[PDB]
Amino acid sequence: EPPVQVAVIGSGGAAMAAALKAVEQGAQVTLIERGTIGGTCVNVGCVPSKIMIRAAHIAHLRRESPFDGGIAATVPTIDRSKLLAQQQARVDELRHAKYEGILGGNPAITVVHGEARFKDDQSLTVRLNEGGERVVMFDRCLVATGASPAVPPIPGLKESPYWTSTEALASDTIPERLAVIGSSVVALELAQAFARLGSKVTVLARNTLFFREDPAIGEAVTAAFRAEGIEVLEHTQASQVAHMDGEFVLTTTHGELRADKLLVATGRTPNTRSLALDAAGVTVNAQGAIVIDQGMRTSNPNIYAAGDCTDQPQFVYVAAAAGTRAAINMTGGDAALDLTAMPAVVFTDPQVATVGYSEAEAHHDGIETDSRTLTLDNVPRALANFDTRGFIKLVIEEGSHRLIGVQAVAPEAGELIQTAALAIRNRMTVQELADQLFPYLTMVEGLKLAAQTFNKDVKQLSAAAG
Amino acid sequence: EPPVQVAVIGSGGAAMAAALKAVEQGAQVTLIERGTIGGTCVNVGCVPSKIMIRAAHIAHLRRESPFDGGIAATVPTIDRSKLLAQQQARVDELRHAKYEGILGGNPAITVVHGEARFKDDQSLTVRLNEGGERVVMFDRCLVATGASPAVPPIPGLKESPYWTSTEALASDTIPERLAVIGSSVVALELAQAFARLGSKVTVLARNTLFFREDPAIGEAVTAAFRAEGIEVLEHTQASQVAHMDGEFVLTTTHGELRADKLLVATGRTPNTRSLALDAAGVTVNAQGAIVIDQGMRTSNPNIYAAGDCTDQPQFVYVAAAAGTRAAINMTGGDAALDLTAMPAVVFTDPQVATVGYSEAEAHHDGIETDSRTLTLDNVPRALANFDTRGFIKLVIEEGSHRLIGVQAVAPEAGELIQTAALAIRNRMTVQELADQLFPYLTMVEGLKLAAQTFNKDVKQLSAAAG
Ligand SMILES: Cc1cc2nc3c(=O)[nH]c(=O)nc-3n(C[C@H](O)[C@H](O)[C@H](O)COP(=O)(O)OP(=O)(O)OC[C@H]3O[C@@H](n4cnc5c(N)ncnc54)[C@H](O)[C@@H]3O)c2cc1C
Ligand SMILES: Cc1cc2nc3c(=O)[nH]c(=O)nc-3n(C[C@H](O)[C@H](O)[C@H](O)COP(=O)(O)OP(=O)(O)OC[C@H]3O[C@@H](n4cnc5c(N)ncnc54)[C@H](O)[C@@H]3O)c2cc1C
Ligand SMILES: NC(=O)C1=CN([C@@H]2O[C@H](COP(=O)(O)OP(=O)(O)OC[C@H]3O[C@@H](n4cnc5c(N)ncnc54)[C@H](OP(=O)(O)O)[C@@H]3O)[C@@H](O)[C@H]2O)C=CC1
Ligand SMILES: NC(=O)C1=CN([C@@H]2O[C@H](COP(=O)(O)OP(=O)(O)OC[C@H]3O[C@@H](n4cnc5c(N)ncnc54)[C@H](OP(=O)(O)O)[C@@H]3O)[C@@H](O)[C@H]2O)C=CC1
């Protein structure tokens, strides 16, 4: 029973989880990474972005609050060089501790610095970063190559000095004027962060914000953004980009827009063109994403794929869960990833959080539904904070009354969404959820209150009644 | 089938919930209140305190943050007159909308302004606020008279101008120096609020903070308090209070302590001495609390009790839940209050939150346990915030591995505790909890990470792995 030889391409959340699990299951791992160890999350994604957003939150609350009648506010001076140094130090520390140190301190793992492609379904050719090549033979291989920022084909954009999320996060100055092309998670998390740290921000949204989500979400976020001075140009696209006399000049229907920096946040495409997937019989879809089943199996039985390079949702917790289960299956087990109560959080303020079905998604799947939308001016916590921006929306199956989805725009929406996720996992009805005790003056109490509106008027119920 | 005549004494969370439910069940309610409509929660409790604490939070973050290297901070000027006006306006608005307007706009409810006592088990004598008396006959009666701040018998205290929570919340100035006697929820929520709004605060704790809770809680809170300049004198009591030359002078073992204002927060005693409970055969315990079963039944079958005047936990959500169920039982039903997954939240920063059993409580009930304590320096969200004060502690039944309690000291602990409450309600094991997807970079993810440490090393696991 020789150790199974497992090859892993990448070192992000999917690859790390797979490598560690494979080792735990008795395999010898060869991990190939072309760039910085740790991939997107630690280096240019979740961690640095959430740090910058937290800095932004502090800046914002120093600038303004619902309590300014009685607490003086100031325009705080911002030293982005110091903020960036702090951010990078945590990134570097986490990469060393949770990635480099975990791979380096493990004798069942060989790390190769190079770019891999398939030679056949049992071997990779690696172009080594120090030059030349090496062949890596494997019994099983996990492709976990992630994704990269997409670039729309706008004339003049390619040759201009524009930013993706990577360059934005690595910037050592807050630009006076920031233009943002895009209208989803990356665009809006970063637009609000930059605005709060001092930029005059203009968002060019080709449709409306969060266009593919329940429309209540985009409506609430758009209003929030406008309320703190972020310009949101809906149904607006740039037809030309130019960079002249040190600034960006964007041609749009709304007229000419000028800015010091331009962030383009228009999706992330799977990193698969360099892999020679045809050499291993691994099928992709029209977007270039590797097609997998619930066991992370590709069209080739020796090759698995996990994370953003596949057709599954792009979140680090999905990538990791998928990597872990791919490893089980590569080492003789039988695991499947279940996404039925997969929550998602957008780190704007207020936060967006979702889990399960929107009304529209349920209808498209042939489910009969009812819903209730509780505005935050009904939530004691929001009233005590004097900030009632947002809502909590509950979606149920008609008849069974089973909770099947929740969408919320609220401060701490990301915290309360997990109570909704566990309710859905446990197949609870809204009456059962409403019957549980919740602490008074928490945002999560809003789930109880929303659940109660399926049977009675919120305005006619007394404090913590239920 | 004549309408059942239900009398309710009080107008707080228990009484309101009962009155409304009784009416919904077809009864005619006579509600007797000696003071301001709405009782403790709306007027002098939960609502005004959480408002003041939120004001304090803004003041604090304007003063200091983990991002001060790159974001300038100031000592904000505080106008407590304006803050108090804002606070009171929300209190007054909520009393009108959720209490007065709900009672006044209901023809099945008669409100009597006076102090009730029992004449016998079918009638009350009410001393009317406008003078004279009235007898109220009833079929069933709910006693929901709440509690009042307790006063320890310290020489000189009684005749000094000290504060309870009521006077503290109603104060129009921030005192330069505030002394606090007490070491539990009221003392510590208000001590930190006043400190953050500008007071130099000294807490006299007769033992340690949160003495009756898992000791990890008090340790974390004490450290937090000291870290922001609140003096915590453990194992310290005042043996004499004097008020001389405009200031309080407290004699203690640590020597003489002087302050401008003194808050005494040493418990809340049930309001039952004025009720003539012996006239109706209603038994109290040694503390004066009305003894009730899970159906809120007293020793007299026609008389029920709910909220802080009983021996059940003192929270507005318990009082309301109990009032609602008492009403069901007063109108021919069969309901019981289940407190097995009753969460609790303390609105310090970081928050304290608990649900279910501590290790000690489990052991005292004959349950065999294991536990894990995850320090917050292991939680991505806390690391991204550069604030790793606190912990998340999980308690399980040995063998079954069922989660039976959670104690947490963390920002947003009150939000994440509800996920723990639902896990416990649904009888989940820690492995089952750990197997659920949680969003990355939320505080609630900490529950997943803690759950995972029952089977493996946190430090050896990669980002969002599970
Ligand atoms: C700004 C930003 C913020 C985000 N915030 C969040 C968040 O808050 N929460 C959340 O859940 N998700 C977030 N995401 C998404 C999350 O970061 C990704 O879903 C997750 O990191 C994907 O992990 P992965 O392992 O699939 O890929 P990656 O982490 O991208 O790793 C893939 C690795 O493979 C390497 N590679 C590619 N091709 C080859 C090859 N041929 N040979 C060798 N090496 C190769 C790449 O260099 C890369 O290091 C964010 C993303 C961005 C961009
Ligand atoms: C500062 C503070 C902060 C708090 N914060 C929280 C929190 O964040 N969350 C939480 O869950 N709980 C909190 N509590 C506790 C919560 O407020 C109480 O548990 C809850 O309000 C109790 O409700 P109740 O209906 O039992 O009594 P109450 O609201 O006290 O109502 C009792 C009423 O009966 C009246 N009354 C008494 N005797 C008679 C009589 N003989 N005749 C006529 N009328 C009478 C009283 O005047 C009073 O209005 C807090 C308490 C305080 C003091
Ligand atoms: N908190 C978290 O969980 C985070 C997660 N992520 C992950 O990364 C993924 C990628 O994020 P993101 O880049 O925001 O992309 P998304 O795939 O979420 O959305 C694509 C965005 O690009 C717009 N778009 C596409 N093409 C064009 C074009 N030619 N011109 C103008 N706009 C265009 C879309 O507009 P329209 O909608 O109108 O079509 C939409 O706003 C996310 O979906 C998420 O899974 C990223 C950051 C944070
Ligand atoms: N967020 C929330 O849920 C809130 C809830 N409440 C509710 O109201 C209740 C009452 O709160 P609180 O007044 O804090 O009382 P608690 O009953 O929680 O605690 C009593 C406190 O008084 C101290 N004490 C008692 N006698 C003396 C004495 N002679 N000298 C010095 N100290 C003394 C105790 O010390 P030791 O512990 O050492 O014995 C302890 O600190 C709470 O238990 C809670 O149920 C109140 C505020 C907020």
PDB file of N, CA and C in Angstrom, chain A residues 55-123:
ATOM      1  N   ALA A  55     -10.645  49.903   8.606  1.00  0.00           N
ATOM      2  CA  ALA A  55     -10.023  51.245   8.685  1.00  0.00           C
ATOM      3  C   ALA A  55     -11.019  52.296   8.228  1.00  0.00           C
ATOM      4  N   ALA A  56     -11.666  52.027   7.102  1.00  0.00           N
ATOM      5  CA  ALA A  56     -12.683  52.916   6.546  1.00  0.00           C
ATOM      6  C   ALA A  56     -13.844  53.173   7.516  1.00  0.00           C
ATOM      7  N   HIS A  57     -14.262  52.130   8.223  1.00  0.00           N
ATOM      8  CA  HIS A  57     -15.341  52.251   9.186  1.00  0.00           C
ATOM      9  C   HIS A  57     -14.989  53.216  10.310  1.00  0.00           C
ATOM     10  N   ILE A  58     -13.759  53.113  10.808  1.00  0.00           N
ATOM     11  CA  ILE A  58     -13.300  53.993  11.862  1.00  0.00           C
ATOM     12  C   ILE A  58     -13.251  55.431  11.351  1.00  0.00           C
ATOM     13  N   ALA A  59     -12.693  55.636  10.149  1.00  0.00           N
ATOM     14  CA  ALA A  59     -12.631  56.962   9.528  1.00  0.00           C
ATOM     15  C   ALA A  59     -14.015  57.577   9.400  1.00  0.00           C
ATOM     16  N   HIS A  60     -14.966  56.760   8.947  1.00  0.00           N
ATOM     17  CA  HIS A  60     -16.330  57.206   8.749  1.00  0.00           C
ATOM     18  C   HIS A  60     -16.993  57.644  10.031  1.00  0.00           C
ATOM     19  N   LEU A  61     -16.888  56.818  11.065  1.00  0.00           N
ATOM     20  CA  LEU A  61     -17.512  57.143  12.346  1.00  0.00           C
ATOM     21  C   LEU A  61     -16.829  58.302  13.064  1.00  0.00           C
ATOM     22  N   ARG A  62     -15.586  58.597  12.703  1.00  0.00           N
ATOM     23  CA  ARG A  62     -14.931  59.791  13.194  1.00  0.00           C
ATOM     24  C   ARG A  62     -15.477  61.016  12.479  1.00  0.00           C
ATOM     25  N   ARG A  63     -15.891  60.826  11.229  1.00  0.00           N
ATOM     26  CA  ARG A  63     -16.465  61.891  10.412  1.00  0.00           C
ATOM     27  C   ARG A  63     -17.919  62.226  10.775  1.00  0.00           C
ATOM     28  N   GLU A  64     -18.719  61.199  11.030  1.00  0.00           N
ATOM     29  CA  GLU A  64     -20.158  61.366  11.232  1.00  0.00           C
ATOM     30  C   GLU A  64     -20.801  60.185  11.951  1.00  0.00           C
ATOM     31  N   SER A  65     -21.924  60.463  12.601  1.00  0.00           N
ATOM     32  CA  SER A  65     -22.686  59.457  13.323  1.00  0.00           C
ATOM     33  C   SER A  65     -24.077  59.984  13.606  1.00  0.00           C
ATOM     34  N   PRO A  66     -25.013  59.080  13.943  1.00  0.00           N
ATOM     35  CA  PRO A  66     -26.343  59.521  14.339  1.00  0.00           C
ATOM     36  C   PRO A  66     -26.373  60.253  15.691  1.00  0.00           C
ATOM     37  N   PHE A  67     -25.229  60.331  16.376  1.00  0.00           N
ATOM     38  CA  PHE A  67     -25.128  60.977  17.693  1.00  0.00           C
ATOM     39  C   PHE A  67     -24.349  62.298  17.656  1.00  0.00           C
ATOM     40  N   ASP A  68     -24.230  62.906  16.482  1.00  0.00           N
ATOM     41  CA  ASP A  68     -23.381  64.097  16.337  1.00  0.00           C
ATOM     42  C   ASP A  68     -23.982  65.338  17.012  1.00  0.00           C
ATOM     43  N   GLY A  69     -25.274  65.304  17.296  1.00  0.00           N
ATOM     44  CA  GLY A  69     -25.890  66.357  18.101  1.00  0.00           C
ATOM     45  C   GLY A  69     -25.222  66.547  19.439  1.00  0.00           C
ATOM     46  N   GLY A  70     -24.751  65.448  20.020  1.00  0.00           N
ATOM     47  CA  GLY A  70     -24.126  65.466  21.323  1.00  0.00           C
ATOM     48  C   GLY A  70     -22.687  65.005  21.396  1.00  0.00           C
ATOM     49  N   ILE A  71     -22.124  64.530  20.285  1.00  0.00           N
ATOM     50  CA  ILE A  71     -20.712  64.142  20.240  1.00  0.00           C
ATOM     51  C   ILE A  71     -20.047  64.825  19.038  1.00  0.00           C
ATOM     52  N   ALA A  72     -19.054  65.660  19.300  1.00  0.00           N
ATOM     53  CA  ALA A  72     -18.422  66.434  18.236  1.00  0.00           C
ATOM     54  C   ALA A  72     -17.715  65.482  17.284  1.00  0.00           C
ATOM     55  N   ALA A  73     -17.728  65.811  15.999  1.00  0.00           N
ATOM     56  CA  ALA A  73     -17.044  64.995  14.979  1.00  0.00           C
ATOM     57  C   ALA A  73     -15.945  65.832  14.335  1.00  0.00           C
ATOM     58  N   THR A  74     -14.963  65.167  13.726  1.00  0.00           N
ATOM     59  CA  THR A  74     -13.874  65.843  13.013  1.00  0.00           C
ATOM     60  C   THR A  74     -13.643  65.141  11.684  1.00  0.00           C
ATOM     61  N   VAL A  75     -12.994  65.829  10.757  1.00  0.00           N
ATOM     62  CA  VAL A  75     -12.491  65.185   9.558  1.00  0.00           C
ATOM     63  C   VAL A  75     -11.127  64.627   9.953  1.00  0.00           C
ATOM     64  N   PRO A  76     -10.993  63.287  10.076  1.00  0.00           N
ATOM     65  CA  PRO A  76      -9.707  62.785  10.554  1.00  0.00           C
ATOM     66  C   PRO A  76      -8.647  62.822   9.455  1.00  0.00           C
ATOM     67  N   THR A  77      -7.413  63.187   9.807  1.00  0.00           N
ATOM     68  CA  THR A  77      -6.295  63.070   8.867  1.00  0.00           C
ATOM     69  C   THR A  77      -5.980  61.578   8.669  1.00  0.00           C
ATOM     70  N   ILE A  78      -5.741  61.182   7.422  1.00  0.00           N
ATOM     71  CA  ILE A  78      -5.487  59.785   7.059  1.00  0.00           C
ATOM     72  C   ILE A  78      -4.060  59.653   6.540  1.00  0.00           C
ATOM     73  N   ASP A  79      -3.289  58.742   7.126  1.00  0.00           N
ATOM     74  CA  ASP A  79      -1.968  58.399   6.596  1.00  0.00           C
ATOM     75  C   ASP A  79      -2.055  57.018   5.978  1.00  0.00           C
ATOM     76  N   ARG A  80      -2.309  56.975   4.679  1.00  0.00           N
ATOM     77  CA  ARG A  80      -2.494  55.690   3.988  1.00  0.00           C
ATOM     78  C   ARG A  80      -1.212  54.856   3.953  1.00  0.00           C
ATOM     79  N   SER A  81      -0.053  55.508   3.988  1.00  0.00           N
ATOM     80  CA  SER A  81       1.196  54.768   4.091  1.00  0.00           C
ATOM     81  C   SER A  81       1.249  53.923   5.371  1.00  0.00           C
ATOM     82  N   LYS A  82       0.867  54.510   6.504  1.00  0.00           N
ATOM     83  CA  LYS A  82       0.836  53.763   7.752  1.00  0.00           C
ATOM     84  C   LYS A  82      -0.263  52.699   7.761  1.00  0.00           C
ATOM     85  N   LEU A  83      -1.433  53.035   7.236  1.00  0.00           N
ATOM     86  CA  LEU A  83      -2.501  52.035   7.146  1.00  0.00           C
ATOM     87  C   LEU A  83      -2.078  50.873   6.268  1.00  0.00           C
ATOM     88  N   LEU A  84      -1.478  51.171   5.120  1.00  0.00           N
ATOM     89  CA  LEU A  84      -1.028  50.108   4.220  1.00  0.00           C
ATOM     90  C   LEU A  84       0.034  49.241   4.891  1.00  0.00           C
ATOM     91  N   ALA A  85       0.987  49.859   5.598  1.00  0.00           N
ATOM     92  CA  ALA A  85       2.004  49.082   6.323  1.00  0.00           C
ATOM     93  C   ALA A  85       1.383  48.127   7.357  1.00  0.00           C
ATOM     94  N   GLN A  86       0.402  48.609   8.106  1.00  0.00           N
ATOM     95  CA  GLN A  86      -0.296  47.775   9.075  1.00  0.00           C
ATOM     96  C   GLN A  86      -1.005  46.590   8.406  1.00  0.00           C
ATOM     97  N   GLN A  87      -1.731  46.885   7.327  1.00  0.00           N
ATOM     98  CA  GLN A  87      -2.456  45.893   6.528  1.00  0.00           C
ATOM     99  C   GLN A  87      -1.517  44.811   6.006  1.00  0.00           C
ATOM    100  N   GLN A  88      -0.447  45.257   5.363  1.00  0.00           N
ATOM    101  CA  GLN A  88       0.534  44.329   4.782  1.00  0.00           C
ATOM    102  C   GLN A  88       1.231  43.461   5.821  1.00  0.00           C
ATOM    103  N   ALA A  89       1.511  44.035   6.984  1.00  0.00           N
ATOM    104  CA  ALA A  89       2.144  43.265   8.061  1.00  0.00           C
ATOM    105  C   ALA A  89       1.263  42.095   8.528  1.00  0.00           C
ATOM    106  N   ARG A  90      -0.039  42.326   8.637  1.00  0.00           N
ATOM    107  CA  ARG A  90      -0.948  41.250   8.995  1.00  0.00           C
ATOM    108  C   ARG A  90      -1.038  40.216   7.861  1.00  0.00           C
ATOM    109  N   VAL A  91      -1.126  40.681   6.615  1.00  0.00           N
ATOM    110  CA  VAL A  91      -1.090  39.775   5.458  1.00  0.00           C
ATOM    111  C   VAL A  91       0.172  38.900   5.492  1.00  0.00           C
ATOM    112  N   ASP A  92       1.324  39.539   5.649  1.00  0.00           N
ATOM    113  CA  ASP A  92       2.610  38.825   5.625  1.00  0.00           C
ATOM    114  C   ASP A  92       2.713  37.827   6.788  1.00  0.00           C
ATOM    115  N   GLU A  93       2.253  38.244   7.957  1.00  0.00           N
ATOM    116  CA  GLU A  93       2.262  37.395   9.147  1.00  0.00           C
ATOM    117  C   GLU A  93       1.351  36.167   8.979  1.00  0.00           C
ATOM    118  N   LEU A  94       0.165  36.380   8.422  1.00  0.00           N
ATOM    119  CA  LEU A  94      -0.770  35.278   8.173  1.00  0.00           C
ATOM    120  C   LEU A  94      -0.259  34.317   7.099  1.00  0.00           C
ATOM    121  N   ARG A  95       0.332  34.849   6.036  1.00  0.00           N
ATOM    122  CA  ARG A  95       0.919  33.990   5.003  1.00  0.00           C
ATOM    123  C   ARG A  95       1.994  33.070   5.602  1.00  0.00           C
ATOM    124  N   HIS A  96       2.839  33.633   6.454  1.00  0.00           N
ATOM    125  CA  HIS A  96       3.924  32.864   7.055  1.00  0.00           C
ATOM    126  C   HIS A  96       3.374  31.783   7.990  1.00  0.00           C
ATOM    127  N   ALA A  97       2.429  32.163   8.840  1.00  0.00           N
ATOM    128  CA  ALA A  97       1.951  31.278   9.906  1.00  0.00           C
ATOM    129  C   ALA A  97       0.997  30.202   9.397  1.00  0.00           C
ATOM    130  N   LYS A  98       0.008  30.612   8.613  1.00  0.00           N
ATOM    131  CA  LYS A  98      -1.081  29.725   8.197  1.00  0.00           C
ATOM    132  C   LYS A  98      -0.862  29.044   6.839  1.00  0.00           C
ATOM    133  N   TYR A  99       0.172  29.449   6.104  1.00  0.00           N
ATOM    134  CA  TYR A  99       0.443  28.878   4.778  1.00  0.00           C
ATOM    135  C   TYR A  99       1.889  28.369   4.663  1.00  0.00           C
ATOM    136  N   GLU A 100       2.854  29.281   4.590  1.00  0.00           N
ATOM    137  CA  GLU A 100       4.253  28.893   4.400  1.00  0.00           C
ATOM    138  C   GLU A 100       4.714  27.914   5.480  1.00  0.00           C
ATOM    139  N   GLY A 101       4.451  28.256   6.741  1.00  0.00           N
ATOM    140  CA  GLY A 101       4.876  27.453   7.891  1.00  0.00           C
ATOM    141  C   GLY A 101       4.195  26.104   7.991  1.00  0.00           C
ATOM    142  N   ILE A 102       2.964  26.038   7.500  1.00  0.00           N
ATOM    143  CA  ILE A 102       2.216  24.789   7.474  1.00  0.00           C
ATOM    144  C   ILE A 102       2.687  23.865   6.340  1.00  0.00           C
ATOM    145  N   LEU A 103       3.008  24.437   5.182  1.00  0.00           N
ATOM    146  CA  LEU A 103       3.564  23.656   4.069  1.00  0.00           C
ATOM    147  C   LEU A 103       5.022  23.286   4.312  1.00  0.00           C
ATOM    148  N   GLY A 104       5.808  24.237   4.811  1.00  0.00           N
ATOM    149  CA  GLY A 104       7.241  24.032   5.031  1.00  0.00           C
ATOM    150  C   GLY A 104       7.556  23.035   6.134  1.00  0.00           C
ATOM    151  N   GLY A 105       6.728  23.025   7.174  1.00  0.00           N
ATOM    152  CA  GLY A 105       6.933  22.143   8.321  1.00  0.00           C
ATOM    153  C   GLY A 105       6.288  20.781   8.167  1.00  0.00           C
ATOM    154  N   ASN A 106       6.050  20.372   6.919  1.00  0.00           N
ATOM    155  CA  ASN A 106       5.401  19.102   6.631  1.00  0.00           C
ATOM    156  C   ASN A 106       6.180  18.283   5.593  1.00  0.00           C
ATOM    157  N   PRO A 107       6.872  17.220   6.050  1.00  0.00           N
ATOM    158  CA  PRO A 107       7.721  16.385   5.182  1.00  0.00           C
ATOM    159  C   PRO A 107       6.978  15.532   4.141  1.00  0.00           C
ATOM    160  N   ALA A 108       5.653  15.463   4.232  1.00  0.00           N
ATOM    161  CA  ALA A 108       4.843  14.772   3.230  1.00  0.00           C
ATOM    162  C   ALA A 108       4.454  15.705   2.078  1.00  0.00           C
ATOM    163  N   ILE A 109       4.951  16.945   2.121  1.00  0.00           N
ATOM    164  CA  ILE A 109       4.623  17.970   1.133  1.00  0.00           C
ATOM    165  C   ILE A 109       5.901  18.521   0.491  1.00  0.00           C
ATOM    166  N   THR A 110       5.934  18.497  -0.835  1.00  0.00           N
ATOM    167  CA  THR A 110       6.949  19.156  -1.637  1.00  0.00           C
ATOM    168  C   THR A 110       6.304  20.338  -2.362  1.00  0.00           C
ATOM    169  N   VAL A 111       6.847  21.530  -2.138  1.00  0.00           N
ATOM    170  CA  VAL A 111       6.391  22.749  -2.805  1.00  0.00           C
ATOM    171  C   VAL A 111       7.301  23.060  -3.979  1.00  0.00           C
ATOM    172  N   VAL A 112       6.682  23.287  -5.128  1.00  0.00           N
ATOM    173  CA  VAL A 112       7.395  23.596  -6.354  1.00  0.00           C
ATOM    174  C   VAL A 112       6.948  24.982  -6.797  1.00  0.00           C
ATOM    175  N   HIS A 113       7.917  25.855  -7.041  1.00  0.00           N
ATOM    176  CA  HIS A 113       7.644  27.218  -7.484  1.00  0.00           C
ATOM    177  C   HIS A 113       7.728  27.277  -8.996  1.00  0.00           C
ATOM    178  N   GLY A 114       6.574  27.257  -9.644  1.00  0.00           N
ATOM    179  CA  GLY A 114       6.503  27.215 -11.098  1.00  0.00           C
ATOM    180  C   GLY A 114       5.074  27.162 -11.584  1.00  0.00           C
ATOM    181  N   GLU A 115       4.911  27.227 -12.904  1.00  0.00           N
ATOM    182  CA  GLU A 115       3.594  27.142 -13.529  1.00  0.00           C
ATOM    183  C   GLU A 115       3.366  25.764 -14.141  1.00  0.00           C
ATOM    184  N   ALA A 116       2.322  25.088 -13.671  1.00  0.00           N
ATOM    185  CA  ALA A 116       1.978  23.740 -14.126  1.00  0.00           C
ATOM    186  C   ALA A 116       1.013  23.736 -15.299  1.00  0.00           C
ATOM    187  N   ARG A 117       1.182  22.738 -16.162  1.00  0.00           N
ATOM    188  CA  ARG A 117       0.172  22.384 -17.144  1.00  0.00           C
ATOM    189  C   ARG A 117       0.146  20.875 -17.240  1.00  0.00           C
ATOM    190  N   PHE A 118      -0.955  20.334 -17.737  1.00  0.00           N
ATOM    191  CA  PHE A 118      -1.060  18.889 -17.910  1.00  0.00           C
ATOM    192  C   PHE A 118      -0.258  18.425 -19.110  1.00  0.00           C
ATOM    193  N   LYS A 119       0.446  17.312 -18.925  1.00  0.00           N
ATOM    194  CA  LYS A 119       1.120  16.616 -20.010  1.00  0.00           C
ATOM    195  C   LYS A 119       0.194  15.504 -20.479  1.00  0.00           C
ATOM    196  N   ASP A 120      -0.382  14.801 -19.510  1.00  0.00           N
ATOM    197  CA  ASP A 120      -1.434  13.814 -19.736  1.00  0.00           C
ATOM    198  C   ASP A 120      -2.227  13.678 -18.428  1.00  0.00           C
ATOM    199  N   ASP A 121      -3.108  12.683 -18.313  1.00  0.00           N
ATOM    200  CA  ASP A 121      -3.896  12.564 -17.081  1.00  0.00           C
ATOM    201  C   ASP A 121      -3.164  11.929 -15.906  1.00  0.00           C
ATOM    202  N   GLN A 122      -1.858  11.714 -16.029  1.00  0.00           N
ATOM    203  CA  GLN A 122      -1.058  11.252 -14.896  1.00  0.00           C
ATOM    204  C   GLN A 122       0.216  12.072 -14.687  1.00  0.00           C
ATOM    205  N   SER A 123       0.359  13.208 -15.374  1.00  0.00           N
ATOM    206  CA  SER A 123       1.554  14.021 -15.198  1.00  0.00           C
ATOM    207  C   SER A 123       1.401  15.473 -15.642  1.00  0.00           C
TER     208      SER A 123
END
